[model samples]
Structure formats: C-alpha cells, structure tokens
Target: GPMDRYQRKIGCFIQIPNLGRGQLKYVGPVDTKAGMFAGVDLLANIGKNDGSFMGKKYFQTEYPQSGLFIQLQKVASLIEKAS
Candidate 1:
C-alpha cells in the first residue's frame, strides 16, 4: 500500500513515561524511503479556577533497518535532577 507522506508505518513504536499501562495517544509519522519517523512535543500549564497541574509530552523517533532511534532532549527539570 502507498502510505501518505505523513502516515504511520507498521513495526514502529515509541516509549512514553508516566503513561499508565495501555494508554493510547495520537502521533504523526513522516514518510521516507528508508523507513518512517515521528516526533512529539510536551508542554505544561496551570489549570484555571482549580489547583491542578496539566502538561503534555512530545517525542520523535527514527526507524532504520537496524532499529528505532529516539531523539531525546533533556529539559531543565531533568538536568536539575542529574546535578
């Protein structure tokens, strides 16, 4: 089948932390001759009229014949923890 330019391909997966078991979310995949790749972004915000916190996370993964490679960037929170 001819995949769309930004359609997801089979045999690809990404690792997401803090998601309970079997949590499903939307992901965009980029088409390439070698394989498919996808990326995600994360954000954070304070709830209005409620003392609650909310945030979103993003990720991008590259898939080659060898295996899946994740392009991860550490945030300030991660760096602080490492120190």
Candidate 2:
C-alpha cells in the first residue's frame, strides 16, 4: 500500500493543503464516546485555540483563531519525514 501521507503528530511543523503551514499543537486520536469516528486535529489556525472536536480535551492558544480541525484524509501532511 502507498504511504498514508496523512499521519500527523504534535510538534511536527508542516504545510497542510488550503489551511497553509502551521505547527501541530495537539496530536493523537480524538477521544470520543458512542461514535465510530476517529480523527486528528491539525493546529494550523495559528495562535488560537479555544477549539475542540467531539469529546476529549482540547487546547487553547494565544491570539484568536480556530483550529485547523481536520479529520483523517481531510488534510495531507505536505512534508515528508526523512528521518
């Protein structure tokens, strides 16, 4: 199978399509209850938090903006990790 190219992680700075480049403030599987949906939130909103997806714990950032708030496949990791 081809690389997923969508695996995101915290601290990984990369460019996301449409949303532009931003550091991933929060990373990991979205913890939710009574749902068959699991996804990741790409912190590309830059400097703003006050955002969350479903349940689980969300983060708050400086400035004012909404999180990239992306689900798997919704965005692609534009940068490829060589390491």
Candidate 3:
C-alpha cells in the first residue's frame, strides 16, 4: 500500500482499491499439512503472476499490509469482467 503505519507514502504498489483485477494465476497453497495452514491459495502478487515468491519478493506493503503476512483469509478476492 502507499500509506505506511504512520501514514507514510511509499512506492508499494498493492493497495486496497488499486489491487489488480486480472485473475490470479494459481501458484500454490499456503500449506498442505494437516492443519488450518493447509490448502490455501496464495497467488503470485505481480501482474505476470508467474507463481514465484523467492527472495524478498512478497510485499510488506503499508503498515497494515505487512500485517497481512500472505494470509488469504485476510481479504476477499474480487473477480470482475472487462471494462
């Protein structure tokens, strides 16, 4: 997100309203163990959606964004047709 915890505007691209509309190419589940962490969809965050999150890839985003922690249950995925 643009606003950090103290309302600082960083270059973080992913924001609430600005979140991309294209379908997230399924990367993989968050986990696959015998627990709640298993079988959750965590897509590639970028437009290419190449399903890669190696290195410092994931977005810390804004303050609340960092807290998101790549959790799918955190927010609802919205899919819409073309404009």
Candidate 4:
C-alpha cells in the first residue's frame, strides 16, 4: 500500500504510468535540466530508449529499448507483500 515510506534508489523496484514495473538504474539530472530524473530498466522492452537519452548514456540495460527516463514525481516505488 501507499502507507509504507520508501525512497527512490538504485536497485529498488518502481512503476511509472504506462511503463509498468521495473528496477531503477540511474537517478540524477540529464543534459542540464537541473532536476532529478530516474532511469529504469524495465522487465519488458516496452520502453523507448536503451538507457540513453538525447544522445547521452546514463546507464545500460540488459535488454534493448528497455530503459526509461522520467521525473521523480512521476515515479512510484513498489513494495511487494510479504508472504
């Protein structure tokens, strides 16, 4: 649920709208935007880029076109239920 407090970090699972679930790869600014952005390596290749945005490579993905760069505010951390 949303009750749990979690911070966005590398290796953490996250979900973005229309992107489904994925693991965070890189977290920082890109091309002088001066704001925080998240680079995610999705489990599926439904993403747009391969960890490179606007000709800049922030990270690498195991799968092609499985990387997504989005603002932090548009991101949501995922916490799986314990069995």
**Candidate 2 steric clashes:** 0
Question: Which candidate achieves the best lDDT against the true structure?
Answer: 4
lDDT of 2 by residue, 1-83 (tens): 22233333444665655566555554335555342211223443453344555544465444345454454334343334411
Model 2 alpha-carbon miss at residue 43, Å: 8.4
Off by over 4 Å in 1: 1-15, 18-34, 44-83
For model 2, the run of ten residues with the poorest summed lDDT: 33-42
What is candidate 3's lDDT per residue for 1-83, written digit by digit as tens? 31123122122223334433222222223333221110112233333222223332333322222222233333222211111
Ranking by lDDT: 4, 2, 3, 1
Clashes of 3: 0
For model 3, name the residue pairs that clash.
none
List of clashing residue pairs for candidate 1: 39-60, 40-58, 40-59, 41-58, 42-57, 42-58
How do these models rank on TM-score, best leading?
4, 2, 3, 1
lDDT of 1 by residue, 1-83 (tens): 33332233222332344521111112233233234322322222111111111222223222111122122231212222321
Error of 4 at 21 (Å): 0.9
- For each candidate, the alpha-carbon lDDT, in order, equals 0.24, 0.43, 0.26, 0.68
Model 2 stretches with alpha carbons more than 4 Å out: 1-8, 29-49, 53-57, 79-83
Worst lDDT 10-window in candidate 3:
33-42
RMSD of 4: 5.3
TM-score to true structure, per model: 0.18, 0.46, 0.24, 0.69
Give the winner by lDDT: 2 or 3: 2
- Model 2: how large is the Cα RMSD against the reference? 5.6
Q: After TM-score superposition, what is the CA distance of residue 44 in candidate 4 from its true location, in Å?
A: 1.8
